[PDB]
Amino acid sequence: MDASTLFKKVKVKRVLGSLEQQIDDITTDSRTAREGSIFVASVGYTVDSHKFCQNVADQGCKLVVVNKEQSLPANVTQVVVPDTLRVASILAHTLYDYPSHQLVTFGVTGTNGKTSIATMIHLIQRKLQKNSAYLGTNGFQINETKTKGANTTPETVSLTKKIKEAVDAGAESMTLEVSSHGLVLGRLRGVEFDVAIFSNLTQDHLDFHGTMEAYGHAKSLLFSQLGEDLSKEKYVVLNNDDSFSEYLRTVTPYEVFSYGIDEEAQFMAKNIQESLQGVSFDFVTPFGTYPVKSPYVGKFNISNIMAAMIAVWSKGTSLETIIKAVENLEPVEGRLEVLDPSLPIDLIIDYAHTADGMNKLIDAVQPFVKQKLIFLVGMAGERDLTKTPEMGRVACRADYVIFTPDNPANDDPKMLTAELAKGATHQNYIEFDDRAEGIKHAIDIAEPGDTVVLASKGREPYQIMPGHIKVPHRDDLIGLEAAYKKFGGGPVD
Amino acid sequence: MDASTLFKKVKVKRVLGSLEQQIDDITTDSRTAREGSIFVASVGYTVDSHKFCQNVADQGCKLVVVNKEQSLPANVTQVVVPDTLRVASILAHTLYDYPSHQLVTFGVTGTNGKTSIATMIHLIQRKLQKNSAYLGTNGFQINETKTKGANTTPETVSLTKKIKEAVDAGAESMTLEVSSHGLVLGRLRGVEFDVAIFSNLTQDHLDFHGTMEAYGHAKSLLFSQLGEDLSKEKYVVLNNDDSFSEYLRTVTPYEVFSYGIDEEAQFMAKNIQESLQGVSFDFVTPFGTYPVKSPYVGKFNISNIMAAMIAVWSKGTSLETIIKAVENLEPVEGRLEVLDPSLPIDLIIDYAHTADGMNKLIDAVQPFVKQKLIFLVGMAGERDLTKTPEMGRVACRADYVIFTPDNPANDDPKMLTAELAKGATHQNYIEFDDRAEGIKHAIDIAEPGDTVVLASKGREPYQIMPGHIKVPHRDDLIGLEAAYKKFGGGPVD
Numbered sequence: 001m002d003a004s005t006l007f008k009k010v011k012v013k014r015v016l017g018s019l020e021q022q023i024d025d026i027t028t029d030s031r032t033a034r035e036g037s038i039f040v041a042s043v044g045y046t047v048d049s050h051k052f053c054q055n056v057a058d059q060g061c062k063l064v065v066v067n068k069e070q071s072l073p074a075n076v077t078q079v080v081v082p083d084t085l086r087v088a089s090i091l092a093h094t095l096y097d098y099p100s101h102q103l104v105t106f107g108v109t110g111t112n113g114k115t116s117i118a119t120m121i122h123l124i125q126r127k128l129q130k131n132s133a134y135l136g137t138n139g140f141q142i143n144e145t146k147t148k149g150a151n152t153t154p155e156t157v158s159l160t161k162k163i164k165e166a167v168d169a170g171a172e173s174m175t176l177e178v179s180s181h182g183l184v185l186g187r188l189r190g191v192e193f194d195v196a197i198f199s200n201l202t203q204d205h206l207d208f209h210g211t212m213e214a215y216g217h218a219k220s221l222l223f224s225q226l227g228e229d230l231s232k233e234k235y236v237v238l239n240n241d242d243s244f245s246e247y248l249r250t251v252t253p254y255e256v257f258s259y260g261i262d263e264e265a266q267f268m269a270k271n272i273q274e275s276l277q278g279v280s281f282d283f284v285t286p287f288g289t290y291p292v293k294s295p296y297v298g299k300f301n302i303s304n305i306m307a308a309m310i311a312v313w314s315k316g317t318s319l320e321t322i323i324k325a326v327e328n329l330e331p332v333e334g335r336l337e338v339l340d341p342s343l344p345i346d347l348i349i350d351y352a353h354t355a356d357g358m359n360k361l362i363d364a365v366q367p368f369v370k371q372k373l374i375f376l377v378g379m380a381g382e383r384d385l386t387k388t389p390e391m392g393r394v395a396c397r398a399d400y401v402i403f404t405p406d407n408p409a410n411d412d413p414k415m416l417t418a419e420l421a422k423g424a425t426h427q428n429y430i431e432f433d434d435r436a437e438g439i440k441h442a443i444d445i446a447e448p449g450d451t452v453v454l455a456s457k458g459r460e461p462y463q464i465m466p467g468h469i470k471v472p473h474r475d476d477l478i479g480l481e482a483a484y485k486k487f488g489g490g491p492v493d
Numbered sequence: 494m495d496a497s498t499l500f501k502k503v504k505v506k507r508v509l510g511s512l513e514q515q516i517d518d519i520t521t522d523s524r525t526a527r528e529g530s531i532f533v534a535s536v537g538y539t540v541d542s543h544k545f546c547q548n549v550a551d552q553g554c555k556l557v558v559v560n561k562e563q564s565l566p567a568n569v570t571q572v573v574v575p576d577t578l579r580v581a582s583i584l585a586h587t588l589y590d591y592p593s594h595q596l597v598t599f600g601v602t603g604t605n606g607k608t609s610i611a612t613m614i615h616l617i618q619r620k621l622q623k624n625s626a627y628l629g630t631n632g633f634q635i636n637e638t639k640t641k642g643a644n645t646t647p648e649t650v651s652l653t654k655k656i657k658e659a660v661d662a663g664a665e666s667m668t669l670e671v672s673s674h675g676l677v678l679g680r681l682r683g684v685e686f687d688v689a690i691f692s693n694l695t696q697d698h699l700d701f702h703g704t705m706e707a708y709g710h711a712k713s714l715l716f717s718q719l720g721e722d723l724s725k726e727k728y729v730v731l732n733n734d735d736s737f738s739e740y741l742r743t744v745t746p747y748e749v750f751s752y753g754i755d756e757e758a759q760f761m762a763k764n765i766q767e768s769l770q771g772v773s774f775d776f777v778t779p780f781g782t783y784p785v786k787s788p789y790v791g792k793f794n795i796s797n798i799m800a801a802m803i804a805v806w807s808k809g810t811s812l813e814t815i816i817k818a819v820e821n822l823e824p825v826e827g828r829l830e831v832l833d834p835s836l837p838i839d840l841i842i843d844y845a846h847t848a849d850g851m852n853k854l855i856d857a858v859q860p861f862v863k864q865k866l867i868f869l870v871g872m873a874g875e876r877d878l879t880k881t882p883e884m885g886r887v888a889c890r891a892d893y894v895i896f897t898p899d900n901p902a903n904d905d906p907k908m909l910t911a912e913l914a915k916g917a918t919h920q921n922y923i924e925f926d927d928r929a930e931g932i933k934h935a936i937d938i939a940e941p942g943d944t945v946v947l948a949s950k951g952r953e954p955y956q957i958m959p960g961h962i963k964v965p966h967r968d969d970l971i972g973l974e975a976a977y978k979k980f981g982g983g984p985v986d
C-alpha cells in the first residue's frame with residue numbers, strides 16, 4: 001500500500017520528499033531495510049540507529065522515520081516525528097491490517113509461569129485440532145513449526161510481523177508471553193488481547209523497575225490495556241493465591257475468572273495427588289467439580305494448568321473437552337522435565353531462576369527423593385543480585401548444591417557463584433566458573449537412587465558469554481552424556 | 494430487550510427463576526427499581542443495598558442481581574454473581590447499546606483543571622454549532638440545559654444513563670471529568686474514551702489513595718484503558734509542565750500531543766499578556782504559530798485552554814476555527830470569575846481548594862492588586878488534613894486572610910479553620926465557624942480599590958452540614974449582597 005495512506009495515521013510529522021511510493025515492509029533494524037521498506041530509527045541501549053540511514057538508502061530504502069532530520073540524498077523521503085517507536089507500532093499494525101484483531105489473542109504475564117501457561121494454552125488448542133501460534137521465551141511457534149528468538153517479548157515490529165505470520169498461516173488463536181519489560185518499553189503497542197492471564201508477582205527485574213510497586217504496576221498494563229468496549233467478549237483470569245490479583249481486578253471492566261489452591265476461588269484444585277509422572281486433582285468449577293489428570297509435575301503446574309484451561313474455556317470451549325485434551329499434553333520444554341526415566345537416578349531439568357521459582361521446584365520434587373537431592377543452579381549475569389543469596393539459601397534445601405553462572409555475559413562468573421554462596425545454610429556446596437563442568441560434577445557425586453536437578457536453563461541452547469556472545473550449551477545433553485558414562489544405558493553410538 | 498439476551502454476556506452466574514422477561518431499565522438504587530428494571534445490589538460505604546430487595550419486589554421489579562441468594566418471593570428472578578457492580582456496568586452498557594461508542598468522548602483527569610478543561614471543550618463544540626454534552630462537578634449538561642448531580646464522576650449506572658441521554662439528544666461528542674475515585678471504584682467501567690487529557694498531578698485525595706504513587710497510578714488508568722486497537726482514531730493530550738506526563742506516555746500506544754508554557758512541548762504559549770479581562774498569547778504549534786485571545790484569567794487557564802483546543806483539534810477541526818471560537822467563550826462557572834466589575838473593589842470567586850490550586854489563583858490575581866488582597870478560603874470536611882496548613886501558608890500570600898469551613902459535614906468547623914491557621918506566616922488572619930459570616934467580614938474589611946477573593950466553592954449552592962445535610966449557600970450571592978450594602982450599586986429591589 002502507499003506511504004501516503006500509512007502516514008495519514010500520524011498527525012504530527014514533518015515530511016521531506018514524496019509519499020507516493022509503495023510500502024510493503026517496515027523495520028526498526030537497518031540491516032533488513034530495502035526498496036519498499038520504511039526504516040524507523042531509534043535510540044537503543046547500545047546504538048542510535050539514526051546513524052544507519054545512509055546504509056538503508058544504499059540498500060534501496062526510500063523512506064525513513066526519524067526524530068531529527070538526517071543527512072541523506074534528496075530522493076529518500078524523511079518523516080520527522082517526536083516519537084519514532086510509537087509511530088513504528090502505528091505504521092506496522094496499519095500496514096499488516098491489524099493482525100491482532102484477526103484472531104483470538106491470549107496474553108500471559110507474571111513473574112514465573114508465563115512460558116508454562118502460554119505453552120499449555122497452545123498445546124490445548126492443538127489437541128482440539130485448532131491452528132494455534134505461540135510467542136515467548138521458547139521462540140515463535142505456528143502449530144508444530146518452531147523458530148528461536150532473542151526475547152520473550154520481541155520489539156514491536158518483529159512482534160507485529162509474527163502475529164501477521166500467524167494470521168496468514170491460518171491460526172485461530174495466538175498466545176503471547178507478556179514480559180513486564182515488553183509492556184513498559186512499548187513492544188506490545190497495538191497488540192489487542194482478548195484474554196489476559198496472571199500467574200504471580202514475586203521479586204524479580206528490579207534492576208529494571210527499581211521497585212516492586214513499579215513492577216506490579218507494569219504488569220497491570222496488560223489488564224487495563226484490554227480497554228473499555230464492553231461489546232467485546234474479553235476475559236481476565238487471575239490467581240487468587242497471589243495477593244496482587246486484588247489490585248488487578250480494579251484496572252479492567254471485563255469479567256474476572258479466579259483460580260486457587262490455597263485461597264477460595266471460582267475454579268479450585270482439591271484432593272491433589274502428586275507423582276513425577278504427573279498429577280490428579282478434583283477441579284472445582286462454578287458448574288460442577290470434575291476429575292483432572294495432568295502430565296505436569298507439581299502444585300505450581302496445577303495453578304498453571306488451571307489458568308490455561310480457564311483461558312480456553314472463556315472463549316467458548318466446553319470444560320469437559322478441555323479436561324480430556326489436557327490428559328496427554330506434551331511437555332513444556334525446559335520446565336520440570338524428567339529426563340530418561342530408565343536411569344538409576346532421577347535426572348530432572350528445570351528453568352527455575354528466582355527464589356520463588358526454586359522453592360516451587362523443590363516443593364514439587366522433594367517428596368519423591370528416596371535418598372539425596374543433588375541440586376545445580378545458576379545465577380544470570382548482569383541482573384539484579386539483591387535476591388541471589390536468597391536463591392542460594394533456597395538451594396540449600398537440597399543435600400548437595402552446585403552453583404554455576406547462567407549467561408554470565410560480561411560479569412565475572414566467580415562473582416555470580418560467590419553471590420549465590422553467600423546464602424548457603426550448610427557446607428555441602430561447590431562453585432564452578434564453568435556450568436558444563438558443574439553438571440559433570442553433579443553426576444560424579446550422584447549415587448544410584450539419588451535425585452539430580454539442573455535448574456535455571458532447561459534446554460536453552462547457549463551460554464551468553466563476554467561480548468554478549470552465545471556459545472552452545474545444553475544442560476539436558478551435557479547431563480545425559482555424563483549420566484550414561486557413569487551409569488550405562490543410553491542410545492547406541 | 495429480554496433478560497436472557499442481557500445475561501448471555503455474564504459467564505459466571507447462578508440464576509433462580511426465568512429470564513424470559515423484558516428489561517428496559519437498570520439501577521443500583523432500589524428507590525427507582527420497577528417492573529422491567531434490573532436492580533443490582535451492592536455494598537456501599539453506608540448501607541448494603543441487598544437489604545432492599547424486598548422493597549424492589551414490592552415496587553414490581555422481578556429481577557435482582559446479588560452477591561448472595563436473598564429471601565424473596567419465588568416470582569422474583571435472582572442472578573447470583575461474584576461481583577455485582579462489575580456486572581451492573583456490563584448490563585448497563587449492553588442495555589443502552591454501548592452509548593460511549595456512539596459519539597466522540599473526551600475524558601479529562603488531573604488534580605486541578607478537570608472542570609475548566611472539560612467545560613472549555615464543551616463550550617468550543619457549542620461555538621462550532623455542534624451538539625455537545627458535559628458531565629462533571631458542575632453537573633450534567635446537554636447543550637445549554639443543565640441539571641446538578643452528587644458527584645464529579647457518578648456511579649456506573651447513572652453515568653451510563655447520562656451518556657445514553659446525550660446520544661439520544663443527538664450529541665456529537667461528550668466530555669467527562671474523570672475523577673481518580675471514579676477510575677479506581679469502577680464508575681467508568683465500559684466508558685470508551687476517544688481522547689484522554691491530563692492537566693497535572695499534585696497532592697490531593699490521599700485519604701483515599703494513601704500515597705502519591707497510588708494516586709498517580711489511578712489517573713494513568715484513563716490513558717491505558719484507551720486500549721490497543723490502532724485502527725481507532727484515539728489521542729492523548731499531556732502537559733509537559735508536569736513531570737507525571739513522562740510516565741503517562743508509557744501506558745498507551747496512541748499518538749501523544751504535548752502542551753507547555755515552562756517546558757518545551759509541541760504546542761506552547763509564548764509572549765503571554767495578562768489582565769482580569771482575559772489573556773493574549775502566541776500559540777506555537779507544529780503547523781505554525783498563531784495569536785490567541787482568551788477570556789479566561791491567568792497562566793493556569795492558558796494551560797487549560799491549550800489542552801481544550803488540542804483535544805478538539807485532534808478529532809479533525811482546524812486550529813484556525815478553534816482559535817476564533819475561543820475568543821468569546823463563556824465563563825466556566827465558579828472558576829476565577831470576576832464579579833460585577835462596576836464595584837469599587839475587585840470581587841472574585843474561585844474554586845481553589847488545594848495548595849497548588851491556591852498558588853495558581855493567587856499568581857493570576859496578585860499582579861492586578863492595586864492596594865490590598867483580602868483572601869477567604871475554606872477547608873473541606875472529612876478530607877485528608879495533611880496539606881491544610883500548607884493551604885493556610887499559601888493563603889498568607891494575601892494581606893488579610895479569612896479562614897472558613899467548606900462542606901464541614903460531621904467535622905467540627907473550628908477544627909478545620911484552626912488547621913488552616915497552623916500554616917499562617919503572618920498575624921493578619923481571622924477564623925469563622927460560619928462561612929457566610931466570614932464573607933460579610935471580608936467586605937467589612939475591604940476599602941475602595943481593594944481586591945477580595947472568595948476561594949474553594951465558586952457558585953456551589955450548598956454547605957454540606959452535620960448528617961451530611963445540604964443547606965443553601967452561595968459565595969457569589971452572599972458576597973454581592975454584602976458588597977452592594979457597603980459600596981452601593983447593584984440592581985433595584
Ligand SMILES: CC(=O)N[C@H]1[C@@H](OP(=O)(O)OP(=O)(O)OC[C@H]2O[C@@H](n3ccc(=O)[nH]c3=O)[C@H](O)[C@@H]2O)O[C@H](CO)[C@@H](O)[C@@H]1O[C@H](C)C(=O)N[C@@H](C)C(=O)N[C@H](CCC(=O)N[C@@H](CCCCN)C(=O)O)C(=O)O
Nearest residue numbers: 028029030044045046047049151152153155179181353456
Ligand atoms: C536491554 C535490552 O532490553 N536490550 C534489548 C534491546 O537491545 P539494544 O537497545 O541494546 O539494541 P541496539 O541498541 O543494538 O539497537 C537499537 C535499535 O537499532 C537497530 N539497529 C542496530 C544495529 C544495526 O546494525 N542496525 C540497526 O538498525 C536495532 O534493530 C534496534 O531496533 O533491543 C534488542 C532488539 O529489540 C533486544 O533484543 C534486547 O534484548 C536483550 C536480548 C535482553 O536481554 N533484554 C532483556 C532485558 C529483556 O527484554 N527481557 C525480557 C524478559 C526476559 C528475561 O529477562 N528473562 C531472564 C531469563 C533468566 C534465565 C536465563 N536462563 C533474563 O534474561 O534475565 C524479555 O526478553 O521480554
Ligand SMILES: CC(=O)N[C@H]1[C@@H](OP(=O)(O)OP(=O)(O)OC[C@H]2O[C@@H](n3ccc(=O)[nH]c3=O)[C@H](O)[C@@H]2O)O[C@H](CO)[C@@H](O)[C@@H]1O[C@H](C)C(=O)N[C@@H](C)C(=O)N[C@H](CCC(=O)N[C@@H](CCCCN)C(=O)O)C(=O)O
Nearest residue numbers: 521522523537538539540542644645646648672674846949
Ligand atoms: C465515599 C463515597 O465515595 N461515597 C459515594 C457512595 O456513597 P455510599 O457508598 O455511602 O452510598 P450508600 O452506602 O448509601 O449506598 C450504596 C448503594 O446502595 C444504593 N441504596 C442506598 C439507599 C437506598 O435506599 N437504596 C439503595 O438501593 C445506593 O444507590 C448505592 O448504589 O455512593 C454514592 C452514590 O453513588 C456517592 O454519591 C457517594 O459520593 C459522595 C457524595 C462523595 O463525596 N464521594 C467522593 C469521595 C467522591 O466520589 N469524590 C470524587 C471527586 C470529587 C471530590 O472529591 N471533590 C472534592 C471537592 C472539594 C471542594 C468542595 N468545595 C471533595 O469532595 O473533597 C467524585 O465525586 O468523583
Ligand SMILES: Nc1ncnc2c1ncn2[C@@H]1O[C@H](COP(=O)(O)OP(=O)(O)O)[C@@H](O)[C@H]1O
Nearest residue numbers: 111112113114115116300335351352357360361
Ligand atoms: N506458577 C508458578 N509459580 C511459581 N513458580 C513457577 C510457576 N510456574 C513455573 N515456575 C517455576 O519457574 C520456572 C520458570 O517457569 P516459566 O513458566 O518458564 O516462567 P516464565 O516464563 O514467567 O519465566 C519453572 O521452570 C518452575 O521452576
Ligand SMILES: Nc1ncnc2c1ncn2[C@@H]1O[C@H](COP(=O)(O)OP(=O)(O)O)[C@@H](O)[C@H]1O
Nearest residue numbers: 604605606607608609793828844845850853854
Ligand atoms: N491547570 C491548573 N493548574 C493549577 N490550578 C488550577 C488549574 N486549573 C484550575 N486551577 C485552580 O483550581 C481550581 C479548580 O479548578 P477546576 O478546573 O474546577 O479543577 P477540578 O475540576 O480538577 O477540581 C480553580 O478554580 C483554580 O483555582
Ligand SMILES: [Mg+2]
Nearest residue numbers: 110111112204
Ligand atoms: Mg519474569
Ligand SMILES: [Mg+2]
Nearest residue numbers: 114115137152
Ligand atoms: Mg518465559
Ligand SMILES: [Mg+2]
Nearest residue numbers: 603604605697
Ligand atoms: Mg482532584
Ligand SMILES: [Mg+2]
Nearest residue numbers: 607608630645
Ligand atoms: Mg471538577
